[PDB]
Design a protein around this nucleic acid. Sequence first.
RNA 1: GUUAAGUCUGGUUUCCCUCCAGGGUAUCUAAGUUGA
Length: 344
Amino acid sequence: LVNAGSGSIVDYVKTVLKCIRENLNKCSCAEKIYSNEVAKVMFRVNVEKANVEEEVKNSLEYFETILNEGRIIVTPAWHVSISSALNRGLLVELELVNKHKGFVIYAGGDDLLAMLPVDEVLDFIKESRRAFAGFGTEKLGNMCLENGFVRINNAYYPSLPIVGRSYSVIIAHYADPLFFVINDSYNLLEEGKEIIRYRVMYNGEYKDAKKDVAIFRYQGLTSVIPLSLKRPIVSSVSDFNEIASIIDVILELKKRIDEGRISVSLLYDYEKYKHLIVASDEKYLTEFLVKDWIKRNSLRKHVEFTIDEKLYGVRLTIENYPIKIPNDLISNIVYTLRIIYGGE
RNA sequence: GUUAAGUCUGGUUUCCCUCCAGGGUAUCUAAGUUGA
Ligand SMILES: [Mn+2]
């Protein structure tokens, strides 16, 4: 609310909110806020009438309703803005799919149902989840998304940088019956997003979180990759890059495994380090531990690719479902690698 | 006062090692699922 204003008006609204703060008063704090509103009407030369009695009371009553109910009161402009941004993000994702040799079955606004090669699925997931939040570097036709908005030749249309987004991936044999393939895709993307909890901190406190993940499945293997690790998934221009940050790590690691700098034994050798590292309790200890686990399959001479130290302590939970999952994000990273390869 | 004649023995006994140091340091592994 206080940020929604542009101009000296923000002072009035935040001091009203302070009058709403801690059940402070009505009919009483309507002076401090008013000794500025009347100041403002006297700050001009042609004002006609003021019923500040009614007006500041209604202005406080608005925010009081907002907070008591607990939701921004929706007006038609809200709906048409969300829907327009939905369609524009859809236009972005249409050429994001086409950027990765994909075939759209249904891409409409919020959702998506495409078919891509098993090779560029991770790239597409990353770039799509970022473009949904208006954060990208490509021109996608006539549309050049810019850090939370959608620039279209000087037109800055909004985006959905607050809305999370889940992702299901089914690595399927071309002879697999599409009935069960589509049903498994839908049932993962439904069950899992409601049923999984992964560690997140907002306000500096390790809490849980449910949506905005990426589930993978390969004929029995499953993995989940959290996409935000922040509950106001972005609130600054800073956190725009944090989106899908775990995915570029998996992409880099797959970039090392292919070129023959790491051996796929990496994907079968993390279990022994996992006991040590999840009971481990210091940062740089676990840092060196993963560095040397990789440095038994080697990544490089004079190692250069470490895991970015935000990935540890992240524990993924599940509400006791047949979907078995490792309780930690790095084991899920390596299962995502197993699932991607298993389809190549 | 005088005569003669030398004869016996032919190195023993102790101590033969004592004390400390009995490994130290560095490396502790690196580099690397595909087809029906
Ligand atoms: Mn649903």
